[PDB]
Amino acid sequence: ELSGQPPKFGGSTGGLLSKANREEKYAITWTSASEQVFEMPTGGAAIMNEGENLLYLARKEQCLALGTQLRTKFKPKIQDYKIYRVYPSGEVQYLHPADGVFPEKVNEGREAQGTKTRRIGQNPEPVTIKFSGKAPYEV
Amino acid sequence: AVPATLSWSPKVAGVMIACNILAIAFGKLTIKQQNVGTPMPSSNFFGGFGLGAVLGTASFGHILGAGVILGLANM
Amino acid sequence: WLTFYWHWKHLGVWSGNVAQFNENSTYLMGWFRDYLWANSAQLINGYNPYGVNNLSVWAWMFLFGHLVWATGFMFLISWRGYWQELIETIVWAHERTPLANLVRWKDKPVALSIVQARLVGLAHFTVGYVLTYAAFLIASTAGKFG
Amino acid sequence: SHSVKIYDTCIGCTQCVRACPLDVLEMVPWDGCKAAQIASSPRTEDCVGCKRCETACPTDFLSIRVYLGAETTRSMGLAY
Amino acid sequence: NQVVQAYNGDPFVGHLSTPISDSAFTRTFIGNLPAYRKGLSPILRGLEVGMAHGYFLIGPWTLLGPLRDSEYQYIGGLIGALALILVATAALSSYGLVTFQGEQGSGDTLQTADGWSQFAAGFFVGGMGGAFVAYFLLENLSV
Amino acid sequence: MDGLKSFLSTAPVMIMALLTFTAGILIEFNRFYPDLLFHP
Amino acid sequence: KAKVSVDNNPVPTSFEKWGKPGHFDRTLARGPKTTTWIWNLHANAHDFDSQTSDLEDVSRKIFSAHFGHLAVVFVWLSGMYFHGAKFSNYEGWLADPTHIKPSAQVVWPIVGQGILNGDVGGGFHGIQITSGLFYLWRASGFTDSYQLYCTAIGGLVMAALMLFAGWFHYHVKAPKLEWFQNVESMMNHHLAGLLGLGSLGWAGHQIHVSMPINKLLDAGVAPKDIPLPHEFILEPSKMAELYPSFAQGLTPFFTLNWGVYSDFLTFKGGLNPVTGGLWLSDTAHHHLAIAVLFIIAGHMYRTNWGIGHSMKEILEAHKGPFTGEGHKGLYEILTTSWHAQLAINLALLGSLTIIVAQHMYAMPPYPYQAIDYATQLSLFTHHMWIGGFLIVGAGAHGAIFMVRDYDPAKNVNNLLDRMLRHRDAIISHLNWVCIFLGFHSFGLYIHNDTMRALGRPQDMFSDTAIQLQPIFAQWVQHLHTLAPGATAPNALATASYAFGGETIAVAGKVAMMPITLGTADFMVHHIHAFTIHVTALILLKGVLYARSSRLVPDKANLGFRFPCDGPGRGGTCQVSGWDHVFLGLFWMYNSLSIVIFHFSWKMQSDVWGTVSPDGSVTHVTLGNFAQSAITINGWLRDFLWAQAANVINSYGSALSAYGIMFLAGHFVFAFSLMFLFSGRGYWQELIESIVWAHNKLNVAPAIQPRALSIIQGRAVGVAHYLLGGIVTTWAFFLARSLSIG
Amino acid sequence: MDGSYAASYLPWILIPMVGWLFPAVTMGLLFIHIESEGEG
Ligand code: CLA
Ligand code: CLA
Numbered sequence A: 001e002l003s004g005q006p007p008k009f010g011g012s013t014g015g016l017l018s019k020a021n022r023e024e025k026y027a028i029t030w031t032s033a034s035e036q037v038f039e040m041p042t043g044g045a046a047i048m049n050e051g052e053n054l055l056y057l058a059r060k061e062q063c064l065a066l067g068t069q070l071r072t073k074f075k076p077k078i079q080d081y082k083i084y085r086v087y088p089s090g091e092v093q094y095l096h097p098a099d100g101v102f103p104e105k106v107n108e109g110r111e112a113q114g115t116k117t118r119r120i121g122q123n124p125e126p127v128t129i130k131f132s133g134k135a136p137y138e139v
Numbered sequence B: 001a002v003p004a005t006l007s008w009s010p011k012v013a014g015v016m017i018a019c020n021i022l023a024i025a026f027g028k029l030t031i032k033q034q035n036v037g038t039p040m041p042s043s044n045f046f047g048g049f050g051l052g053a054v055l056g057t058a059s060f061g062h063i064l065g066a067g068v069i070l071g072l073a074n075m
Numbered sequence C: 001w002l003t004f005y006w007h008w009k010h011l012g013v014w015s016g017n018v019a020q021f022n023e024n025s026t027y028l029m030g031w032f033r034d035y036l037w038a039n040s041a042q043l044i045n046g047y048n049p050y051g052v053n054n055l056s057v058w059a060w061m062f063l064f065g066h067l068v069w070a071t072g073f074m075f076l077i078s079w080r081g082y083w084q085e086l087i088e089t090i091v092w093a094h095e096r097t098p099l100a101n102l103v104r105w106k107d108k109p110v111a112l113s114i115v116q117a118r119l120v121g122l123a124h125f126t127v128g129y130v131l132t133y134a135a136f137l138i139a140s141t142a143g144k145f146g
Numbered sequence D: 001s002h003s004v005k006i007y008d009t010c011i012g013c014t015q016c017v018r019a020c021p022l023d024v025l026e027m028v029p030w031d032g033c034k035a036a037q038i039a040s041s042p043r044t045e046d047c048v049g050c051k052r053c054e055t056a057c058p059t060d061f062l063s064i065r066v067y068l069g070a071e072t073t074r075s076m077g078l079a080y
Numbered sequence E: 001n002q003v004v005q006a007y008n009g010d011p012f013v014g015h016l017s018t019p020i021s022d023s024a025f026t027r028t029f030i031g032n033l034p035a036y037r038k039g040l041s042p043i044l045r046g047l048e049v050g051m052a053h054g055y056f057l058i059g060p061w062t063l064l065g066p067l068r069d070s071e072y073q074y075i076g077g078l079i080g081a082l083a084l085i086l087v088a089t090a091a092l093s094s095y096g097l098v099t100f101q102g103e104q105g106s107g108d109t110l111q112t113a114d115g116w117s118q119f120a121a122g123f124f125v126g127g128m129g130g131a132f133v134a135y136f137l138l139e140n141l142s143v
Numbered sequence F: 001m002d003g004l005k006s007f008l009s010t011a012p013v014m015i016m017a018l019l020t021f022t023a024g025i026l027i028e029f030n031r032f033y034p035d036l037l038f039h040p
Numbered sequence G: 001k002a003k004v005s006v007d008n009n010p011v012p013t014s015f016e017k018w019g020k021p022g023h024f025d026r027t028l029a030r031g032p033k034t035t036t037w038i039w040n041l042h043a044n045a046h047d048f049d050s051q052t053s054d055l056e057d058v059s060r061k062i063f064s065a066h067f068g069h070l071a072v073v074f075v076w077l078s079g080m081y082f083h084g085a086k087f088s089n090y091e092g093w094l095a096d097p098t099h100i101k102p103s104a105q106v107v108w109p110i111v112g113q114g115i116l117n118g119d120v121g122g123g124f125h126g127i128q129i130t131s132g133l134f135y136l137w138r139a140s141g142f143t144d145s146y147q148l149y150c151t152a153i154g155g156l157v158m159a160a161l162m163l164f165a166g167w168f169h170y171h172v173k174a175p176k177l178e179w180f181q182n183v184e185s186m187m188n189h190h191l192a193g194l195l196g197l198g199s200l201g202w203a204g205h206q207i208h209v210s211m212p213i214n215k216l217l218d219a220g221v222a223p224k225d226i227p228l229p230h231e232f233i234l235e236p237s238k239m240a241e242l243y244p245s246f247a248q249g250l251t252p253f254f255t256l257n258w259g260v261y262s263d264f265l266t267f268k269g270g271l272n273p274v275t276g277g278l279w280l281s282d283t284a285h286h287h288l289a290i291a292v293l294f295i296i297a298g299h300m301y302r303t304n305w306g307i308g309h310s311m312k313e314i315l316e317a318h319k320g321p322f323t324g325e326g327h328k329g330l331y332e333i334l335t336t337s338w339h340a341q342l343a344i345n346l347a348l349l350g351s352l353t354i355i356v357a358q359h360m361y362a363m364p365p366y367p368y369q370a371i372d373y374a375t376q377l378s379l380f381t382h383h384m385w386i387g388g389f390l391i392v393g394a395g396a397h398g399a400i401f402m403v404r405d406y407d408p409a410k411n412v413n414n415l416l417d418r419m420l421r422h423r424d425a426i427i428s429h430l431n432w433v434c435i436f437l438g439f440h441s442f443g444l445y446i447h448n449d450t451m452r453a454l455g456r457p458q459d460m461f462s463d464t465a466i467q468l469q470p471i472f473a474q475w476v477q478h479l480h481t482l483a484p485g486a487t488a489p490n491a492l493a494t495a496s497y498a499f500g501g502e503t504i505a506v507a508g509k510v511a512m513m514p515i516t517l518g519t520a521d522f523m524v525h526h527i528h529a530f531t532i533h534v535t536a537l538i539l540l541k542g543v544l545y546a547r548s549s550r551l552v553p554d555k556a557n558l559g560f561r562f563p564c565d566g567p568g569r570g571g572t573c574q575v576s577g578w579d580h581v582f583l584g585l586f587w588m589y590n591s592l593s594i595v596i597f598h599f600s601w602k603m604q605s606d607v608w609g610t611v612s613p614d615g616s617v618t619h620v621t622l623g624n625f626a627q628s629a630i631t632i633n634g635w636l637r638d639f640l641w642a643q644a645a646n647v648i649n650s651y652g653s654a655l656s657a658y659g660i661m662f663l664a665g666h667f668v669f670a671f672s673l674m675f676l677f678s679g680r681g682y683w684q685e686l687i688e689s690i691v692w693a694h695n696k697l698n699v700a701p702a703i704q705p706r707a708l709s710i711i712q713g714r715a716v717g718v719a720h721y722l723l724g725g726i727v728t729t730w731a732f733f734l735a736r737s738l739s740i741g
Numbered sequence H: 001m002d003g004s005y006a007a008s009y010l011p012w013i014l015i016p017m018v019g020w021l022f023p024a025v026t027m028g029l030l031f032i033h034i035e036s037e038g039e040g
């Protein structure tokens, strides 16, 4: 499964709701060298332990916001945070980072999908592709 | 129907001095920092108090005496 | 503007007092006083602390329009994110209430979209705008003449 | 879900990737620019259409465009 | 000492322990309500809930309703309560029809189509019973 | 002073100066010759 | 031998940076590339926190700017004094105050505005003023124009002194940061040296100057036969024959035989039957007691002799079981963040101004004020608007603090953290109470309207129908009326006749009479409660959710003032705290408008009026409030329509300037809707076309024009909207109240 | 309420149906239809 040792937090009302155990939730794990204080994206501040920490949140944006805070708002930076999606059936899908290297930097083994080979000004006219169920970008 | 007050008399002086001495007794045990600030020449006679402590307890004594004297005059 | 002009001119024509419009239509205070303030007297007295006459429905609809027109300003002025945050708080409140978690929604409540907000505000605005003037016109002309 | 498309005017400046808060973009090797890299959007199912990526793009008009479409729980950013 | 802590041992859930969220008295009072009690059939649950919810609805129309002045006052309250309970049963039945029409489970017998339908029927009959007993108490003579 | 002259030549100060000049022109012309509906 | 610590000549006094606008900001210093650079210049000016990161530098800037605002206020005050000395009929009004209207503005005749110089009685022609300055001056013992002129000169001199003080204490000798963080010493000096000493000096002035002059004036002495104020000092016998106790001297004060002073230090209460104001001896004992209390209180916090409490100790020592760390950590919050201090002070001062407005009409202090209805209404509305604006600013700058100065590391399990941790509960319960109040309260009005419309008056919520009696306020009024009897034995009359008692009337006009409370008053007070809770909901949600929210989890990185996070998540318009303030401004306007309408109509209908010599009272609107103010149609017909006859018909008289202004108010309001209802993309495209037009003729500007930003558009809309509405209400109230008395 | 027009009893039943019965029925059916899962 996953690791443990949740950060020392008093809890709040801004945390998980029913969807967490009915649709999906998210997990973020990271190893910190000191037992310090960070800001919970759900309101309030929590103490993260010295060693490994695991935290459950409701949205991927919250996990990535906490990752940004970890990476930027600490003098000894954190680079080993991992974000998984936890399905209600216990199946865990490892989301971020995808290949282990940060997406901001070029790395081999990527597929280059979503790329058009034309300029944005060379898109086909809407009238020509009428009754095709596709917008100009879709072709 | 204004409350009746008291013209100056030795009994009023005694009440004021008693209130002042009770105030100094209160400050002898209630004040946290006492030997602080500008000191007094013969500190022993004031229980090790400083100038600020002496002034504070004396002002508190006059305040307490004023309250007690007015309340007593309005018996 | 068009209908105000037509109505004032024809009120003067029907009453015979064309001089009123001929004099007081050259400055805006005349429009405010001799047309809006002056003719409203019969309308707003449709129902009184002393009684009620046949213009009561028109006074009620007049206030109804003055209300819907103002209601449109919520959607025209305030925008979505505020209401989405408020709805999130309400959702939290409903989910944590005993005896109310038994009943749960099927479609997740959300705030109205931006374009939907503009459309709804404009609709409330237009309905109030039409109803207010319709009530005023009918009531004034019916009380004065009918 | 929303559709994120990258056109051939990208200069491999990586601003769009960093500006994305939901980790939808990525840097892939390329040859059409000096930087020899281009932007890709492999995880568009996680894009919320916040348009920060477009706001970060420095090219004339936009080398990266976001078209909003069908709304799911992820793309609507719902926590409930 | 600290009367406020995590909700049921997991802080990360969107709730907090309060002297009214998980106190012993709170759980005891809530857990023994007809909608939350143990070992109660859905039909009987509905009967018990409807009895009270229709009993208390007799009030406002009897004292504030348009017929409060006339002798047709408690009757007006009764009619209002009966109409309200009827519409309530219609809404309950609609909710049951639209909610549990997919997969069916028996972990909770209230959260199933047949269970919810029985709850609605018992709620109807309890509403009638409570409204009528309230009318019988309030209304003078008429016997 | 260089900075003083530069500040005096900034946009708001200059537009205020021109506006007050024109206002004075109009005020004086209307004090000496009031009620000019047209040129007869 | 003082805690002072300053730096010498930190900022040179040079003129060059005056010629480089935008110098303070790094971005603006690059000159203008688009028109937005101009707007950012005027907006980023007095925000020093973003300009520099040195807290000491920010503090020095704030200190100097506060000197500047003091200089501006002093210039304004000297202007009022001069314009009352030279261009007023104060000496004329002082002779027959019940027959001469106050007037201190005179209009040059240029294009026919000389019609504005209306007849105020006694052969004087000028604008009637409603600020109540004449009554304040008479209450200060003013009798000559030369004294007012000297006061104006002194105000000018003080303004110059404050300006020089700002220049010195910034550009030459600037205090260090540790000097500012002497919150204990600051509180001591400002509680004792500023408030207590000020009130003591004012009480001395009242006793030694104002009270004898007013006593002589009320007896019929001509305003020129009264001696100059210093004559009561140079000849103490006259003071001793006005008050016998002055013969006794200062001995009873030091012997604590204070009873003999009771001839001029009274506890009368009520109002002066001749001037319609409070007894000046009451204000003397009042300001004296206030001075004594503040002087005592200023000796609380320890500064340099160990005697006294310590704020940090009290803050860390007040904590309970429900609150974890409790009040700990707040001392560093309030001694390192200017915005938190600004928020607290703004909220408290706004509430204080509201209290001033609410208490200043029921106990009219100044002579002949309650008899002047226009002044009462103007002062009430003015200070209430000031209070509302201050409270909204409190909310705004609290949100600013939360975004900027908050640090999670220093607030672990303190009160602030636990606030941030049950905020959903707070907002949910407050939202529910807002909905409940709105529904029940306003639906009462709608229900009454419908019942009246249908010919069902017995089903209404009226006093002759289903009644909603505010029995609690009635009980408290009954109690406060009985206070002179036993609960406050040494008081002669009630604190105010608003609670109950006799009717006090000066000349023929009622000064103050009991203000009963019924069904309509119940509904209006609960409407006030509803509007206030809603405004609090908006501002509190803005403050609590500023850092982040479920929708946007990193709102803090976007700043306090940002328009949106984009059309994503279904649309994220107006999520910042700034937008919360922008939305709260409208609700503050709505609440205060309802409050001032309530005050105006209730006063006109139940209090103000005239008195027949028999003893009967005829009110201005013949007591129609108790039956018409229970429906919206009543507030439309009997208040907005009926009472607007005095303003629309103002053309051709001296009140025309109000009528004009009234229409002006009705215009700008509508104008603001151009900015609230639209968006900047349309205007950007229109500007593109217009720029093409100016480009065709080679006349395009170098500074490329741009449509206003989203935040700027919202700000412009709200500003012009508030201006239009408030100007409308001001013109309406002034024109109405200058036509009834 | 009553009137002198022919068939005065028709409003007595028609108006409640168009005011209560018809709206209740149509909103119930619409709510049922708009929530039926699948068959998109
Ligand atoms: C020990 C001897 C003694 C005696 C016999 C009296 C006797 C008297 N004193 Mg007195 N006094 C004394 C000592 C004494 N005093 C001392 C030592 C002090 C100084 C601390 C005072 C200070 C003092 C003051 C300042 C006053 C009196 C007054 C009085 C008289 C009325 C008191 C009363 O209950 O009415 C009052 C009864 C009430 C029910 C009123 C209390 C309700 C108030 C309004 C609540 C206020 C709310 C408050 C602001 C909120 C709390 C803030 C803060 C404390 C947290 C009474 C003759 C009063 C007087 O002379 O009146 C003519 C008066 O004003 N005394
Ligand atoms: C006349 C115009 C108008 C009206 C009615 C409202 C009404 C409301 N606003 Mg709003 N608003 C307006 C203008 C208006 N606003 C404008 C111009 C702005 C721009 C600044 C805003 C900005 C604004 C904000 C920022 C907020 C509100 C909030 C609220 C709610 C407050 C809760 C309340 O009053 O109880 C509920 C509403 C009422 C009692 C309204 C009266 C309804 C009648 C009396 C009952 C009708 C009976 C029944 C429904 C009939 C059924 C008929 C059948 C055919 C269905 C409420 C929905 C707050 C909110 O979310 O709620 C707490 C909030 O945060 N508004």
Ligand code: CLA
Binding pocket: G062, G063, G064, G066, G067, G070, G179, G180, G182, G183, G185, G186, G189, G190, G193, G194
């Ligand atoms: C007797 C002591 C004393 C007094 C009266 C004041 C008074 C004031 N301080 Mg202050 N202060 C003091 C001690 C004092 N301070 C100490 C010891 C410190 C160090 C901790 C500070 C640090 C401090 C800061 C950091 C700031 C102030 C500010 C202010 C002003 C607040 C604005 C206001 O309320 O308008 C009320 C205005 C008036 C009542 C008009 C008074 C005009 C002058 C300044 C008063 C001079 C009176 C003086 C005693 C001479 C009178 C003698 C004789 C004529 C009777 C106010 C004038 C603020 C400021 O900058 O304002 C300029 C501010 O930000 N104070």
Ligand code: CLA
Binding pocket: G042, G043, G044, G045, G046, G047, G048, G049, G389, G390, G391, G392, G393, G394, G396, G397, G400, G560, G561, G578, G581, G719
């Ligand atoms: C003691 C009072 C006080 C003080 C010292 C400050 C200080 C500050 N505020 Mg604050 N504020 C206050 C009261 C106060 N505020 C109140 C009462 C409100 C509620 C409306 C606000 C709302 C507020 C917001 C929303 C913001 C600030 C900001 C700021 C910062 C500087 C930027 C700024 O506003 O300057 C520049 C100010 C202007 C350019 C305003 C000029 C334009 C005004 C609106 C026109 C007024 C017209 C006038 C009323 C009538 C003229 C009519 C016309 C025909 C001539 C600064 C820390 C800003 C910030 O975040 O900085 C950190 C910010 O965004 N404040």
Ligand code: CLA
Binding pocket: H010, H011, H012, H014, H015, H018
């Ligand atoms: C669209 C035309 C129209 C409209 C607006 C009305 C309006 C009205 N009719 Mg009426 N009526 C109509 C046509 C219409 N009638 C026709 C053609 C007939 C002959 C069968 C009748 C026979 C009739 C009777 C016998 C009575 C009314 C009554 C009434 C009033 C009660 C409300 C009501 O409609 O329910 C009752 C009305 C009906 C059930 C009529 C059926 C509807 C007609 C036949 C077709 C309407 C279809 C329409 C186009 C659908 C548009 C959908 C759109 C909203 C999206 C109301 C003023 C009552 C009345 O006067 O009370 C005082 C009453 O007793 N109507």
Ligand SMILES: CCCCCCCCCCCCCCCC(=O)OC[C@H](COP(=O)(O)OC[C@@H](O)CO)OC(=O)CCCCCCCCCCCCCCC
Binding pocket: G318, G319, G320, G321, G322, G323, G326, G327, G415
């Ligand atoms: C009197 C006028 C009519 C009003 C009657 C209505 C009363 C209804 C509620 C009771 C108020 C009790 C407050 C006690 C509460 C109190 O004593 O706090 C006690 C507790 C703090 O106790 P400690 O001793 O731990 O405090 C340590 C402190 O020194 C700070 O660290 O605070 C909390 O638990 C906060 C939770 C409040 C959560 C409930 C908030 C209710 C908000 C609504 C208030 C409604 C009434 C508003 C009237 C203006």
